[PDB]
Nucleic acid binder design. Structure first.
Ligand SMILES: [Mg+2]
Length: 65
RNA sequence: UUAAGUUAUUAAGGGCGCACGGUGGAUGCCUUGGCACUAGAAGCCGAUGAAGGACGUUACUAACGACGAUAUGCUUUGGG
């Protein structure tokens, strides 16, 4: 998810997405550990989305302050 | 045939020359790194946690660089 889409999401929506993304990443890590994951690129894609989600959240908090 | 006299051939190995190999890394050529300077710029950083490190971060990671649990990067504004 690109920053623009994240920016549309409400603060709560971002927080929910952060939780959802982290669970997905965890699942991928366990799948890779068990050798069940072929689409390894997904892991990184999820990671960068979480980073983006956190960035937008931080930007909002700084704007508030 | 006998007597007297004389002189070879031997090369186990060695010597000299030559030829053909091996070893070794000199030499020549070369440059990625140095050396000495010139001109302009700049001449501090740190409790708002430094310098320097440690430990981590990648699909698979021993090492180096980069990065810091947003980790082999994130956003944005310009370039391309
Ligand atoms: Mg651009």
């Amino acid at each position: 998810m690109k920053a623009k889409e994240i920016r549309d999401l409400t603060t709560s929506e971002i927080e929910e997405q952060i939780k959802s993304s982290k669970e997905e990443l965890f699942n991928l890590r366990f799948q890779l550990a068990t050798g069940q994951l072929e689409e390894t690129a997904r892991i990184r894609t999820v990671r960068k989305t979480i980073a983006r989600l956190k960035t937008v959240a931080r930007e909002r908090e700084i704007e508030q302050s």
